[PDB]
Every structure is written in structure tokens, then in C-alpha cells.
Amino acid sequence: SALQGKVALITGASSGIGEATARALAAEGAAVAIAARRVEKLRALGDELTAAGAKVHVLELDVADRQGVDAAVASTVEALGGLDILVNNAGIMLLGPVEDADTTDWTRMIDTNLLGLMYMTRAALPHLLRSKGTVVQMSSIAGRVNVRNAAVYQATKFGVNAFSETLRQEVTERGVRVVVIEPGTTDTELRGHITHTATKEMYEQRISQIRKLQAQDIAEAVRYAVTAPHHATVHEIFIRPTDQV
Amino acid sequence: SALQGKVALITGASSGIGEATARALAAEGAAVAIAARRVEKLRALGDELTAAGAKVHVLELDVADRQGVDAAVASTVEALGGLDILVNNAGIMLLGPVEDADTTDWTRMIDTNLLGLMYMTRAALPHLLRSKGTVVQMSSIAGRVNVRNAAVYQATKFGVNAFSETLRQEVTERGVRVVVIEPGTTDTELRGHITHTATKEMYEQRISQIRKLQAQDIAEAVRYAVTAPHHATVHEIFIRPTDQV
Amino acid sequence: PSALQGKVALITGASSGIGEATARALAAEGAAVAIAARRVEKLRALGDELTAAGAKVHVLELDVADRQGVDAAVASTVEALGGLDILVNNAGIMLLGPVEDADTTDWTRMIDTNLLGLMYMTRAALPHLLRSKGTVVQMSSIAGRVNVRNAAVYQATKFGVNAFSETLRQEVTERGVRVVVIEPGTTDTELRGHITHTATKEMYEQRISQIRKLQAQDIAEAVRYAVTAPHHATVHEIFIRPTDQV
Amino acid sequence: SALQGKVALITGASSGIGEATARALAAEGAAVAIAARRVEKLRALGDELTAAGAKVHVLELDVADRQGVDAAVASTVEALGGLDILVNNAGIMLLGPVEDADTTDWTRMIDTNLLGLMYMTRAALPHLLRSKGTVVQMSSIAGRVNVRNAAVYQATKFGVNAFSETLRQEVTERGVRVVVIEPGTTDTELRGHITHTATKEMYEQRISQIRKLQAQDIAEAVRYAVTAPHHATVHEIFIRPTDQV
Ligand SMILES: NC(=O)C1=CN([C@@H]2O[C@H](COP(=O)(O)OP(=O)(O)OC[C@H]3O[C@@H](n4cnc5c(N)ncnc54)[C@H](OP(=O)(O)O)[C@@H]3O)[C@@H](O)[C@H]2O)C=CC1
Ligand SMILES: NC(=O)C1=CN([C@@H]2O[C@H](COP(=O)(O)OP(=O)(O)OC[C@H]3O[C@@H](n4cnc5c(N)ncnc54)[C@H](OP(=O)(O)O)[C@@H]3O)[C@@H](O)[C@H]2O)C=CC1
Ligand SMILES: NC(=O)C1=CN([C@@H]2O[C@H](COP(=O)(O)OP(=O)(O)OC[C@H]3O[C@@H](n4cnc5c(N)ncnc54)[C@H](OP(=O)(O)O)[C@@H]3O)[C@@H](O)[C@H]2O)C=CC1
Ligand SMILES: NC(=O)C1=CN([C@@H]2O[C@H](COP(=O)(O)OP(=O)(O)OC[C@H]3O[C@@H](n4cnc5c(N)ncnc54)[C@H](OP(=O)(O)O)[C@@H]3O)[C@@H](O)[C@H]2O)C=CC1
Ligand SMILES: O=C(O)[C@H]1/C(=C/CO)O[C@@H]2CC(=O)N21
Ligand SMILES: O=C(O)[C@H]1/C(=C/CO)O[C@@H]2CC(=O)N21
Ligand SMILES: O=C(O)[C@H]1/C(=C/CO)O[C@@H]2CC(=O)N21
Ligand SMILES: O=C(O)[C@H]1/C(=C/CO)O[C@@H]2CC(=O)N21
């Protein structure tokens, strides 16, 4: 139990990567504040983790809401005593051409993937500074490589990376570690949300012929990064499916 | 006159790089639609350009306004007959630490630098597709390199770059050229807007000891890129002050 | 527990630093280790240590810049240990100094060892890795990701290693050969003792004196994490920086 | 004539991009030292340029030869009075898989593309420092993007870029400008040299259905960069064929 007595706040914890990460960190002895919009799914996970001997704090949160963000962080510190690890995992992937796009796709991705992550980072920062803690940014291969029909999604993830590198420069000397996780195709609910029907089906066929990364693989990457000695910042882990060029 | 009979729409044309670019493209024989919020400054530039023999269409526009963007593009095509060149130059640079930041800095930069650019791009695209035209994105060294106290600004510019590369992959085969200009320190009004006083002062001192790039230098980069033969897409020009490591 | 039981790892640059720690780490996971470098005395000492701890060891005197020596070293490893599952291309040298009026033997040495030697080893190992659906680990650097003054040619070799390795990944990944690239920042090893430009050697020492450096063991743990990941996952890049260092 | 009284040394001047660049610079009034191994082709070009009113210095040079490099630079400064522009254009592209590769492909590419370029840069530097001149590195899309069957070639070109950025940091404050040109597919003799037959054929098919960049397009990129005002360093120009995703 490398994380005994530590407090982790995980956004997007109701499914996929965030759910696996919350489990992984709790398994290492961390108290976990689990945040997302689907409260019933969070409660179900919270019950499971509590029944497994973990300390859980359930947070109904929209990361795009600046006020909600500030309250969520304050609630976590109040209920669990501090903040050692923030996992900015909440995100959505809305694929489709730039041409004649539904721009609500764009505003949603920017609010959640970029602004939400930045809001959470900022609110957590005073607490992470005191605990010499770690912020883990859930980026993507989409923050390293551009492919067609993912322009704005890729814009958000490249943006996350630049924000995070800059953040590292700003806070690293005070012992706040900045970790960026960059998964390739991972088998989650993420793709079910694509609003462009033609691209949703194109993407599904594209990834149908590979062994996908599992949510647990990515949780393991986070676990490796956060349990590394404090003098080491695993700033980037770029993990790809072996089957995928 | 390499651009005779062509129409260019330049956002952020009321000062700085956009003003110089509008002059440069007009000098090459292009009809210019000049867009920004300060109508008085646009009118003054429009008068000067018209007095020099250019065809000018003045557009009062906030690029963050989706509806205003659509109307501005439609107004341009109606008044000037089409669209061959879009210069997405409207932008703001609000520097300061992430820690305890004024988050209105962030929303402004994202709305203008990222969302505004993407809105203009999308609205212009049908017209650029017909004319096999060129979209010029005004990025920055901040889209290539991260320094302290520019996290969200750099996020927007790295985002612009990823969006633009992806756009290139999507439209290049149909003859729409995607050009990204990346200036280093350029002597404009840009820095006057920084809301974090300590950072504004720090930045001023940092750039006080170099010969800065001039707005005209960047206009020249744009002119070189857009007058290149159609089979060549000058996708990136990274121009730095020689005095600046 | 032993995630690499029955696997064979060949580690170049095993006589000190990161390669030594990596050979220990892999052996601790149950892998048989072929340890390769030029200082045979140091290899023998490590080999004795590992053998005494219950490991299977094959000692290889090798200059990675030697194309023929490379081929023989791979052949010797597969003959002695039965196959090849993991290659760690760790052999390397860092010769810092300005471009201006540089001692160009600095350059040829770095290119021969860091770039060409790594490529030769990769190529010779590949038929064996293809059969075993194995993993090649490239020891790159922060120098393959960021450029600073007085490390022009070294950074050229490391950026070169990264492009070579990404391209390799595209070529072999579908046949189940995983390409892993490890990118340490400042790590406390013998590496810097070799700098021939005296002024730069001193400048570098002062710059890194103010930080808690990465340990060779930290980097070995990165390698361990990457190679013990399930086969369907290729941890293509791990970029590990000293927390103290902007 | 923006380069009147300037001296340019161009490596790889016997064909392709180097030939076009030597013509373009001479057209701007620069004296040109033209260097390559095929003396006969250099003399024919030298005759052409001299007949057009240019000052020409013919140099038989293998850039992989460190002593030949030193003599070539000394010969140039002796014959033409100094050195204002170096174009490191000599290069070879030997494509093929890593698996079972002919490793003489590798040593040739490293000797010419990387070491030869570095040798030339180093020998020229004292002279460039005096003249506050410009070094132009002929990199490639292969220094920016990795594709299959170009591993070692891409290694040399990514290497050239890192070397050159580092060089910029080291010499830029003393007024030596470092320019990196990155062409995509350009119609030259380059591809005729590929030793791996299957890959040579695969590459030819790949580039058969695009309008390729012309050697003259690349020469124009060099010309734009070197005639920019001294306070501006056009550090990167990334030029892609518009037809090529
Ligand atoms: N799956 C993949 O192939 C890859 C995914 N990623 C990244 O991983 C992250 C997690 O997504 P993934 O697990 O894949 O897919 P999921 O859809 O399963 O997870 C997304 C999670 O984010 C939450 N969420 C979405 N919007 C908000 C919001 N406005 N406020 C708070 N929480 C929100 C969702 O919970 P709820 O709806 O209850 O709010 C959900 O739990 C994303 O950042 C994604 O970009 C990166 C690389 C590869
Ligand atoms: N100066 C520099 O060192 C560098 C600048 N850049 C980029 O260059 C671009 C132009 O900036 P620069 O000329 O330097 O500085 P300026 O402030 O002089 O120009 C910015 C222009 O953008 C306009 N603008 C701002 N917000 C909006 C909006 N929401 N809608 C429409 N127009 C808007 C302003 O006009 P108005 O107020 O009338 O609307 C103004 O004309 C920006 O994209 C910037 O990021 C990139 C690299 C270096
Ligand atoms: N130390 C650091 O801060 C960092 C180092 N690195 C990389 O780590 C790798 C290992 O270096 P590190 O452990 O740091 O320093 P060391 O000097 O301690 O290790 C270098 C190892 O490589 C071997 N070696 C050198 N040249 C050759 C050659 N021609 N043929 C075979 N073996 C050779 C040496 O053994 P011998 O002399 O007996 O042959 C030695 O075992 C290098 O590739 C380096 O670039 C990357 C990031 C940071
Ligand atoms: N064509 C393309 O698609 C692209 C090419 N490039 C780069 O452009 C540069 C020039 O190539 P390009 O013009 O296309 O092809 P060419 O083969 O036509 O030109 C290469 C030139 O380099 C010379 N050369 C080769 N080896 C040496 C050497 N050892 N010493 C001195 N000169 C040498 C050749 O002349 P000689 O045999 O007489 O010595 C020739 O003049 C290269 O660096 C290449 O990597 C970059 C991006 C795209
Ligand atoms: O490679 C993939 O699976 C997907 C992806 C998935 C989630 O980041 O992100 C990038 C954009 C895209 O379509 N890629
Ligand atoms: O280098 C500079 O002058 C400035 C800049 C200016 C406008 O992009 O962008 C980056 C962010 C910053 O502070 N840099
Ligand atoms: O950051 C550092 O400590 C050193 C280094 C060390 C080993 O790669 O590589 C890069 C080049 C340099 O000076 N950096
Ligand atoms: O895109 C291309 O045409 C070629 C190329 C050509 C010359 O650098 O460089 C990259 C490596 C490759 O195959 N690409």
C-alpha cells in the first residue's frame, strides 16, 4: 500500500479509465473522492470501494462549472483532510469533420476536456502545493498525433499537454509533480457519445481489428507514475495498442 | 500583383499583425475584408487602403460570436464576390501564473484564440473549397515552445496548431491550403492587454533587450505563403527574433 | 513474484549506471540476462553478483559501434540462453560542448555508439524478437525531447534514436514486437565523467548540483514497468524528469 | 538584387534543390561557391551561371570528408573574399525496412546527411560569425513526421533539426541566423539512389499521384529566408505538397 494516508480526487470516475483509476488508487491505500455527473453510478462504485475497505467521498460534479469545481475541492479537503493526488480524467470525444460540424460538439469538448481540467487544476493547486502532491492529466494519443475527423478533440488534448508542461515549469520546484498520461485506443464508453453518425461508425470499424487497451492498463500507468519516488516526475507516459500502427 | 482578383478576409485587422497583413495583401492586388471590434480603427485603415486604390469591406466582428462570424463571412462573399484567403489573426495574450489566476483571462483567450478561429475557419470553408483558397492561422512561438506564465495562452496556440494540421489532412486534397504562421516576439499592442500586472511587467523587461519582429515582417511571411504556387502548402513558418535565445 | 520468468534479456551498457540497474531489475523478475559492454572486469563482477543471487548470466564483451561484434554478441546470446525476448539498447556516451570549434571525435563517438550502435543492435536482434514477440527498449533521453545549449550532437543522436524507434514501431508493431522508448532527465551515473570539453563539463556539473537527480534504479523501474505490461500494450514513451528541475 | 556582394556556399549543388538554390541566390546577386562530387555537372552549372553574369567558385567536395570540408571552406573565402550564407543541402535518401537492412545505407546517410552537415557548419562558423551570416539546413518533412521504411533517413533529419535548434541557441545572439528548410516530396534525382528495390518501387507509386514540389519552390523558400531582415530568423519553413495528406 504505497499510498496509505493519501487523498486522491478523480474526475470522470463513473465509468472507464477514471473508474479503474479510482479502484487502483484505493487498492494502494488512498482515500478517494470520486467525481462525475451520474451520481447513481458513483454511488454504486462508492459502495463497492467502501465494502472493499476504502474511504470514499462521492462528488456530483460538472467540471465545466467553475463554482462547482471550487466547491468539490473544498468538500474533498473537508471530508478527507487534504489533497495529495488529482486525476483530471473527465473528458468527452466528439469526432467528425470540421466541415459543417455541429459546433456544440466543440463547446462541449472545450468546456470539459480543456477548461474543466484547468479549473480543477487551479482549485486543487493550493492543496497540492502544501502536500507536495501530484496532478495527473488524462491526455491522449490525440495530444501527440493528429488524424482526420478529430480536429477539435485533438486541439483540446494538445492544449492539455501545453497547459500541463507549462504548469510543470511553474510548480515543479515547489514539489508538485505534473504527470500526463497519453493512452491510445482504450475500451470504454467514450466513443458511444460521438454525435456525427458517419464518423462514429468509421471510428468503430477502424478500432474493431485491434486488441484495445483496457481501462485497467491505463490505471496501472497512473499507479506507476504516482507511486514513483517524489524526486521523479513521470511527466509523460505514451501507451499505445501494440496491434495499432 | 500576385493576388489580383482575389479576396482576403483578415480578422484582427484593426492593429498589429492583422493591419500589416491587410496592407500587404491589398498591395498584392487582393480585395480585403477587414474585421475587428474597434470599428473606428477599421474605418481609418479602410479609408487609407481605399485611398491607395484597394477594394475594402469593413466588418465589425467579435470572432467569439458564432452568429456574427456566419454573417461576416456571408457579408464578405456578397460584397466582394467570393473568398480566396482567410487570415485568422484575431487574438489576445493574457499572461500570468496558473495559480490563483483570473479565469476570465482563460475564457477570453479560448473564445478568441481557439473557438473564434475555429468558427471563422468553419464558416469560410465552403467558400474556400470552391475557390481552392488558403486559410492562414496566426499561431505563435507559443504553439511550439512552452515558457512560464503563459499556460493557457500556449494551450490555445498548440490547440490552433493541432486543429490546423488536422484541417490540412481533411481539406488539402480538395485544394484548400492550410498555412500556420508562428511569430516570436513582435512589436504590437498585444502585450498591453495582460491583466496580471506583475507578469505584464516581467514580460516587458524580458523583451526589452531584443530587436523585436515587426508587424510588417509577419505580413511578409503571410505574403510569401499565400503567393506560393497552389501545389505548395507552406504549412509552417516559424519566425524568431535573431536576438532571442 | 517473477513476471519475466523464462525470458531472455540482452542489456548493452551493462557495466555501470542505468544498464547495470536495469540488468539487476530484469534478473530480479526472473529473466536470464546477457550483459554487454567494453569493461569486461566490471561485467564479470556484476555477473558474479547476479549469478550468486540465483540469476542466469551471459557475459558479453562488446563495442556496439562494431557491426561484426554486434552480430556475434546476439548470436552468442541466443546460443547460450536459448532465445531473445527483450533488448535494452542502453550503451551510450554524452560528450557536451559548443558546436563552435568542437573536437569532432566527440561527434563520431556519439554517433557510432548512441545512434549507429543502437541501430545495429536493433537490426541483429530483430529476427529473434519477431519469433518471441519480444520488446526492444531504447534508452533515449530528455535530450531526445528538448534542446539545450552545448548538447547539439548528443541531442541529434537522441532525437535520431526516437525517430528511428517510432518508425521501427510502425514497421514491426503488427507482428507483436513492442518498441519502448525511455527518456530520463538527469540521472546520477558515470555518464558525465566522459565529457571532453572541460568548461562545459564544469558548467553541466554546476547546473545539476542543485537538484535531486534521478537514480539509475528509477530508470530500471521504468523499464520494468514497460516490459511487464501486457503484450497488447506498448508503452512507447516514458518521459521521466527530476521533479526539482524546470 | 537583395544579396549583392554576399557570398553563398551551396553543398549538393550538382542537381536538384542545391542547383536551384545556387541559381536563385546568384540571381539575387550573391557570389556562389558550388560544391558536390560530380565535377562535370558543377562545371556545366558554373559555366551557365558565369555566362549569366554570376561569380562562381567550383568545389569538388565530399561533405563526409572532414579535411575536404575544411579545405573547401578555406578555398571559398580565399577565392570569394568571405562567407555570408552556407546552404547545407548535400544529402542522400536510402529507403527500406530496418529488418535485414543493408547497413551501408545507414553509414552513407549518417556520413552525408548528419556528420557532413555538422562538419560544414563547424568549418563555416568562424566566417559566418564575422559576417553575421546565415546557415541554411536542408532538412525534410522526414525531420518532422515519421513514416515506414525511412527509419534511418528520418533519424538523420530529426537529428539535423535538433543539432540546428541547438546551434541557434548557441550563435543567434552573435547574429548568425539558423534557418531550417523542411520540404515534402520534391521532384529531384534523390529517389533514384534508393538501394532497396521493393521500397524504391513502393515510394515511386506513393508519390506518383501528387503534384510534387519543384526544386525551384524550395529555392524560393531559401531565398525568402535569407533575404529577410537580419533581426528576423526564419528558423523553420515546412513546405508540403498540397495534394499530399
Ligand atoms: N477511451 C479511449 O480510447 C481514450 C480515452 N482518453 C481519455 O480518457 C478520459 C476518460 O474517458 P473514457 O474513460 O475513455 O470514456 P468514458 O466515457 O467511460 O469516461 C468519461 C468520464 O468522464 C465523465 N465526464 C464527462 N463529462 C463530464 C463533465 N462535464 N464533468 C464531470 N465528469 C464528466 C463521465 O462521467 P459522467 O457522464 O457521469 O459525468 C465519465 O465517467 C477522457 O479524458 C478521454 O479523452 C484518452 C485516450 C484514449
Ligand atoms: N505580438 C506578438 O509578439 C505575437 C502575436 N501573435 C498573434 O498575432 C495575433 C494578433 O496579435 P497582435 O497583432 O500581436 O496584437 P494586437 O492586439 O495589436 O492585435 C490583435 C487584434 O485582434 C483583434 N481582436 C481581439 N479580440 C477580438 C475578437 N474577439 N474579435 C475580433 N477581433 C479581435 C483586435 O482588434 P479589436 O480590439 O478592434 O477587436 C486586434 O486588431 C494574435 O493571434 C496573437 O496571438 C503571435 C505571435 C507573436
Ligand atoms: N545519466 C543521465 O543523466 C542520462 C543518461 N541517459 C542514457 O543512459 C544510457 C546509459 O548511460 P548512463 O548509465 O547514464 O552512464 P554510464 O556511463 O554509467 O553508462 C554507459 C554505459 O554504456 C557502456 N558503453 C559506452 N560506450 C559503449 C560502446 N561503445 N559499446 C558498448 N558499451 C558502451 C558503458 O560501459 P563500457 O565503458 O564498459 O563499454 C556503460 O556501461 C546512455 O545511452 C545515456 O545517453 C539518458 C538520459 C539521462
Ligand atoms: N527531393 C525531396 O523529396 C526532398 C529532399 N530533401 C533534401 O534535399 C537535399 C538535396 O537532395 P535533392 O536535391 O532532393 O536530391 P539530389 O540527389 O538531386 O541532390 C543531392 C545533392 O547532394 C550531392 N551529394 C550527395 N552526397 C554528397 C556528398 N557526400 N558530398 C557532397 N555532395 C553530395 C549530390 O551531388 P553529387 O553526387 O555530385 O555529390 C547532389 O547534388 C537532401 O538533403 C535531401 O535530403 C528534403 C526534403 C524533400
Ligand atoms: O486513436 C484513437 O483511438 C482515437 C482517440 C481515442 C481517445 O483519445 O483519440 C484520437 C483522435 C482519434 O480519432 N483517435
Ligand atoms: O515569446 C514571446 O514574446 C511570448 C509570446 C508572444 C506572443 O505569442 O508567446 C509566448 C508566450 C510568451 O510569454 N511568449
Ligand atoms: O538534462 C540533462 O541532465 C542533460 C542530459 C543528460 C543525459 O541525457 O541530456 C540533455 C543534454 C543535456 O545537457 N541535458
Ligand atoms: O515524403 C516523402 O516524399 C519522403 C521524403 C522525401 C525527401 O525527404 O522524406 C520522407 C521519408 C519518406 O519516405 N518521406
Side-chain angles (χ1 to χ4, degrees):
Chain A
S1 57
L3 296 181
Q4 191 62 56
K6 304 296 178 180
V7 174
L9 168 33
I10 309 98
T11 71
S14 53
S15 63
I17 296 161
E19 176 184 10
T21 302
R23 286 207 192 86
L25 301 180
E28 285 283 20
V32 294
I34 49 169
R37 300 163 308 174
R38 294 169 295 177
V39 256
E40 300 280 20
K41 280 201 182 168
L42 290 176
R43 297 199 218 290
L45 172 64
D47 288 337
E48 168 188 302
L49 294 180
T50 296
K55 224 207 186 192
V56 182
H57 183 61
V58 178
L59 293 161
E60 187 189 281
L61 175 67
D62 189 335
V63 293
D65 175 34
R66 190 198 107 268
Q67 311 253 315
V69 162
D70 296 334
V73 175
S75 197
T76 299
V77 167
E78 167 88 54
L80 302 179
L83 192 52
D84 295 284
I85 303 170
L86 163 70
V87 187
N88 280 311
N89 162 269
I92 44 161
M93 186 187 62
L94 303 169
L95 307 177
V98 177
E99 187 184 349
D100 295 343
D102 182 342
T103 66
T104 71
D105 279 6
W106 300 356
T107 53
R108 281 213 281 161
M109 284 189 283
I110 285 167
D111 281 355
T112 306
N113 300 0
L114 193 61
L115 223 24
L117 175 143
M118 288 169 173
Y119 286 159
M120 271 299 313
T121 293
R122 172 185 176 280
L125 215 44
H127 308 281
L128 298 168
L129 282 159
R130 179 168 168 164
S131 72
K132 310 304 183 178
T134 300
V135 54
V136 181
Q137 316 292 39
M138 193 57 57
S139 189
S140 174
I141 182 168
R144 300 292 306 280
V145 161
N146 297 290
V147 305
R148 303 182 233 196
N149 297 327
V152 177
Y153 181 65
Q154 274 148 187
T156 73
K157 299 288 186 180
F158 270 88
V160 166
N161 286 24
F163 173 78
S164 303
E165 164 52 22
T166 313
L167 178 68
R168 195 200 54 80
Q169 290 182 33
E170 287 178 22
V171 305
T172 207
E173 287 165 312
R174 285 171 289 175
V176 180
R177 305 190 298 179
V178 180
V179 174
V180 189
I181 313 285
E182 291 152 359
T185 315
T186 306
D187 202 351
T188 66
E189 296 178 10
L190 188 74
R191 70 203 189 258
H193 294 98
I194 299 161
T195 64
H196 199 254
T197 321
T199 312
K200 187 179 158 203
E201 82 84 19
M202 270 189 50
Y203 180 67
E204 204 61 51
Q205 299 299 350
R206 200 182 113 205
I207 62 169
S208 67
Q209 286 293 286
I210 62 156
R211 296 166 302 159
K212 296 171 209 196
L213 303 174
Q214 302 298 293
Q216 70 191 328
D217 299 327
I218 313 313
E220 187 58 27
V222 176
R223 194 212 60 87
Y224 159 70
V226 304
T227 66
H230 181 266
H231 70 261
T233 296
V234 184
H235 183 61
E236 269 179 306
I237 308 177
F238 184 14
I239 174 170
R240 291 173 170 266
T242 306
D243 291 346
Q244 192 189 69
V245 170
Chain B
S1 53
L3 300 186
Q4 178 70 327
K6 297 294 155 212
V7 32
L9 164 48
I10 306 95
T11 65
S14 52
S15 64
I17 295 161
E19 168 179 2
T21 307
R23 298 204 206 214
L25 303 187
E28 286 295 338
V32 295
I34 49 166
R37 300 161 304 159
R38 295 167 297 182
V39 267
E40 79 283 4
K41 270 191 189 180
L42 289 167
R43 289 207 212 118
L45 182 59
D47 296 355
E48 187 180 41
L49 291 184
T50 299
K55 205 187 183 188
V56 178
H57 182 71
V58 179
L59 283 171
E60 178 183 303
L61 175 64
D62 189 326
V63 301
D65 189 55
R66 188 190 69 201
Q67 207 100 300
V69 161
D70 279 339
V73 174
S75 182
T76 299
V77 159
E78 200 65 20
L80 303 176
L83 190 58
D84 306 287
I85 296 172
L86 171 62
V87 181
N88 275 310
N89 158 275
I92 43 158
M93 183 182 71
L94 308 169
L95 300 179
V98 171
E99 186 188 357
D100 306 337
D102 186 346
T103 55
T104 58
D105 282 12
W106 296 2
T107 55
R108 287 166 71 193
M109 284 188 288
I110 287 171
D111 284 343
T112 301
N113 301 355
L114 190 64
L115 198 67
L117 181 141
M118 293 180 295
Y119 278 156
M120 279 298 309
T121 295
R122 181 193 170 280
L125 206 51
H127 304 104
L128 297 170
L129 280 163
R130 277 188 212 88
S131 75
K132 282 181 153 222
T134 303
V135 42
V136 183
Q137 314 293 38
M138 192 60 50
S139 186
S140 174
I141 185 172
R144 294 300 299 280
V145 160
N146 295 291
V147 303
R148 280 167 277 202
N149 291 333
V152 175
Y153 183 65
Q154 278 147 180
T156 66
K157 298 293 188 185
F158 272 85
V160 163
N161 285 18
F163 173 78
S164 305
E165 164 50 18
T166 310
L167 177 72
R168 195 200 53 81
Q169 296 181 25
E170 296 178 18
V171 304
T172 206
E173 288 163 317
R174 285 174 283 166
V176 176
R177 301 193 295 177
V178 182
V179 171
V180 183
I181 307 302
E182 295 152 356
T185 316
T186 306
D187 203 357
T188 64
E189 292 176 4
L190 188 80
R191 68 206 191 259
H193 296 107
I194 302 165
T195 63
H196 199 266
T197 315
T199 310
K200 192 189 166 196
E201 213 167 52
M202 275 194 51
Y203 178 71
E204 269 273 293
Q205 306 295 343
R206 185 208 161 202
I207 68 172
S208 63
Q209 305 313 308
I210 60 146
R211 295 166 308 163
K212 300 161 189 149
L213 301 177
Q214 303 285 286
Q216 69 184 314
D217 300 332
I218 315 311
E220 184 50 55
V222 181
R223 199 205 59 87
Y224 159 70
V226 305
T227 65
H230 188 263
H231 68 266
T233 288
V234 182
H235 185 57
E236 276 183 293
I237 302 172
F238 188 8
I239 172 158
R240 292 182 172 259
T242 309
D243 295 349
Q244 189 188 75
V245 177
Chain C
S2 291
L4 299 173
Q5 179 63 43
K7 307 294 184 152
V8 174
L10 165 38
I11 307 104
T12 71
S15 53
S16 64
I18 290 157
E20 179 185 351
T22 302
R24 299 190 188 270
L26 295 181
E29 288 305 335
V33 293
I35 51 179
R38 302 162 303 165
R39 293 169 300 182
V40 206
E41 353 84 2
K42 282 201 171 181
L43 286 170
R44 294 248 206 275
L46 179 62
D48 291 352
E49 191 143 296
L50 297 188
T51 303
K56 193 169 199 164
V57 182
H58 182 53
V59 174
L60 299 154
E61 180 192 310
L62 170 65
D63 190 336
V64 294
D66 180 18
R67 191 202 61 243
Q68 291 171 60
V70 161
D71 287 329
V74 168
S76 188
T77 301
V78 172
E79 183 184 14
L81 304 176
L84 187 61
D85 300 282
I86 305 170
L87 169 67
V88 192
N89 281 311
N90 166 263
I93 48 149
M94 178 177 78
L95 305 182
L96 304 183
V99 173
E100 176 177 13
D101 259 73
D103 175 357
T104 62
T105 75
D106 279 2
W107 301 356
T108 54
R109 284 169 63 193
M110 287 192 282
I111 289 163
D112 285 349
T113 307
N114 299 1
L115 197 63
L116 206 55
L118 174 148
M119 292 166 170
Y120 286 157
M121 281 297 316
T122 300
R123 177 189 168 285
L126 199 57
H128 302 283
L129 293 177
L130 284 159
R131 297 177 192 107
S132 72
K133 289 181 169 164
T135 302
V136 49
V137 187
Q138 316 290 40
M139 196 58 55
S140 188
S141 174
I142 185 169
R145 299 294 305 275
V146 290
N147 291 296
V148 297
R149 283 179 84 159
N150 307 318
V153 182
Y154 180 67
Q155 292 166 156
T157 65
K158 295 300 190 180
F159 273 85
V161 166
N162 290 9
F164 172 83
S165 306
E166 163 56 20
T167 310
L168 181 70
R169 189 200 60 84
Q170 295 176 30
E171 294 177 19
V172 302
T173 201
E174 284 163 315
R175 287 172 288 168
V177 171
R178 307 191 290 182
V179 185
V180 171
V181 182
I182 310 289
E183 293 154 355
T186 318
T187 305
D188 194 13
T189 64
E190 301 185 0
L191 194 74
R192 61 188 180 273
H194 298 112
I195 300 162
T196 65
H197 197 261
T198 291
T200 308
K201 195 184 198 196
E202 291 175 343
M203 218 146 58
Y204 177 64
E205 261 282 311
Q206 189 65 354
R207 173 209 156 182
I208 65 173
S209 61
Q210 302 282 26
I211 59 156
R212 297 163 308 160
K213 295 180 185 144
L214 301 179
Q215 294 309 297
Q217 137 180 73
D218 300 329
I219 312 309
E221 179 56 45
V223 177
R224 193 213 134 276
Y225 157 74
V227 302
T228 61
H231 180 253
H232 72 262
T234 290
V235 183
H236 186 62
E237 251 178 333
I238 305 176
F239 187 15
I240 172 168
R241 291 183 176 252
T243 306
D244 289 344
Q245 186 193 76
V246 178
Chain D
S1 57
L3 292 182
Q4 195 59 40
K6 301 299 191 203
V7 178
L9 172 46
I10 303 100
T11 67
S14 55
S15 65
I17 292 155
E19 183 184 0
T21 299
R23 292 188 201 274
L25 300 181
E28 288 300 315
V32 293
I34 46 172
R37 301 164 304 174
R38 298 165 297 182
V39 198
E40 202 160 45
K41 278 197 176 175
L42 292 173
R43 301 221 164 275
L45 175 64
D47 283 357
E48 202 160 38
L49 298 171
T50 302
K55 200 182 189 193
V56 178
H57 185 54
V58 171
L59 296 154
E60 180 188 328
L61 170 65
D62 173 14
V63 293
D65 175 22
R66 183 198 49 93
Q67 288 164 350
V69 161
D70 279 353
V73 170
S75 187
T76 298
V77 171
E78 192 283 327
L80 301 178
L83 188 58
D84 297 288
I85 300 158
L86 170 61
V87 187
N88 282 313
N89 165 271
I92 51 160
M93 182 181 72
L94 303 173
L95 304 184
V98 175
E99 180 179 7
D100 218 53
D102 180 341
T103 58
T104 70
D105 286 2
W106 296 6
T107 59
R108 287 174 69 195
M109 278 187 293
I110 285 166
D111 285 354
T112 305
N113 300 359
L114 196 65
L115 213 52
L117 177 148
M118 290 167 173
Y119 284 155
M120 279 298 322
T121 300
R122 180 193 166 270
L125 199 54
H127 301 280
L128 294 178
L129 287 157
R130 303 187 187 102
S131 69
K132 296 190 172 163
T134 304
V135 52
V136 182
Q137 315 291 38
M138 197 58 59
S139 187
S140 174
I141 183 164
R144 294 303 299 281
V145 179
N146 292 293
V147 298
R148 298 183 237 196
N149 303 320
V152 180
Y153 182 67
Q154 285 155 172
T156 66
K157 294 300 185 178
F158 272 85
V160 164
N161 288 10
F163 173 79
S164 305
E165 164 57 18
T166 310
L167 181 72
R168 189 198 61 82
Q169 292 183 36
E170 290 174 29
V171 302
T172 201
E173 294 167 307
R174 284 169 291 161
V176 171
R177 300 189 300 179
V178 183
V179 166
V180 183
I181 311 291
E182 294 146 4
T185 317
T186 307
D187 201 359
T188 65
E189 289 173 11
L190 192 77
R191 61 189 193 276
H193 292 108
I194 300 157
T195 55
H196 196 259
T197 295
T199 306
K200 189 185 201 185
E201 178 67 351
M202 284 189 109
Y203 178 66
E204 200 71 40
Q205 289 301 51
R206 177 199 166 182
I207 63 170
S208 66
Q209 270 186 15
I210 60 163
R211 291 166 300 165
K212 290 163 192 158
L213 305 178
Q214 301 303 308
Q216 16 290 317
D217 301 327
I218 312 307
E220 286 303 302
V222 174
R223 189 217 162 272
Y224 157 71
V226 304
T227 60
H230 179 255
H231 70 266
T233 292
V234 186
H235 183 61
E236 263 182 312
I237 306 179
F238 187 12
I239 326 162
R240 293 183 168 258
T242 311
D243 295 336
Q244 189 187 79
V245 172

